[PDB]
Write a protein that binds this ligand. Structure first.
Ligand code: NAG
Ligand code: CU
Length: 235
């Protein structure tokens, strides 16, 4: 159970984004139905009033929280991967529009899932804004918690992979458009019952055999990190 509080640009807190530039759901409950429209931007997908201005090559940091800002972030049990996608805002998340910028599942060195490192990072993970056309975009941050993913939700609705989905409204002002955005995948639709990484037993299978759901990271992505970029407690 986790939600996004807001974003930082180049290490500067943009302020409380909930229902302002984040299409916030009413609570931190997971989405589980792979075929639901809730898979796009969670249960309350509507235009919110602000869009955060960035430039190509900026560091965009998402900040997650559980109940209050800079708390335990997410229950330790919720081991799983983190991905970020982008789509043109015009689409409203509909159609074959989502392009993946970031994937982090399991770091073999540190023996930590992306979620374990997100807790240590005080809920902060970043992407570098790609060189796409100037304009209005949705950034979709997605956490998959795998602690009950041995079962499919489609067969046992008590269990299943849990999706924590947040869409931020981002405006890209300055860009050389050297990597125009290609066509992407649909949400709902990209993940099905047979997609790798949706059904997985974290208790019995070693984390090193985990494969994150496709699609793969676009070659125009400039990377990202799970790491604290600012101290929320200095505000
Ligand atoms: C999944 O959501 C779809 C689309 O709204 C709906 O048809 C179906 O009833 C849901 N499945 C379950 C298992 O609730
Ligand atoms: Cu939870």
């Amino acid at each position: 159970h986790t939600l996004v509080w807001g974003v930082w640009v180049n290490g500067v807190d943009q302020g409380d984004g909930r229902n302002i530039y984040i299409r916030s759901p009413p609570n931190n409950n997971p989405v589980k139905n792979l075929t639901s429209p809730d898979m796009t931007c969670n249960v309350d997908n509507r235009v919110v009033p602000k869009s955060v201005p960035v430039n190509a090559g900026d560091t965009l940091t998402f900040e997650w929280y559980h109940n209050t800002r800079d708390d335990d972030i997410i229950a330790s049990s919720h081991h799983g991967p983190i991905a970020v996608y982008i789509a043109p805002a015009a689409s409203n998340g509909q159609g074959n529009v989502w392009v993946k910028l970031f994937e982090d599942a399991y770091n073999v060195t540190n023996s930590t899932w992306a979620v374990d490192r997100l807790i240590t990072a005080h809920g902060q993970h970043s992407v570098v804004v790609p060189h796409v056309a100037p304009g209005d975009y949705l950034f979709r941050a997605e956490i998959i918690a795998l602690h009950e993913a041995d079962s499919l939700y489609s067969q046992n609705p008590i269990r299943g992979a849990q999706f924590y989905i947040s869409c931020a409204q981002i405006t890209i002002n300055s860009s050389d458009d050297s990597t125009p955005l290609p066509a992407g995948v649909p949400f709902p639709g990209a993940y099905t019952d047979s997609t790798p990484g949706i059904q997985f037993n974290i208790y019995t299978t070693p984390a090193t055999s985990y494969v994150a759901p496709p699609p793969s990271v676009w070659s125009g992505a400039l990377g990202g990190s799970i790491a604290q970029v600012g101290d929320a407690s200095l505000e």
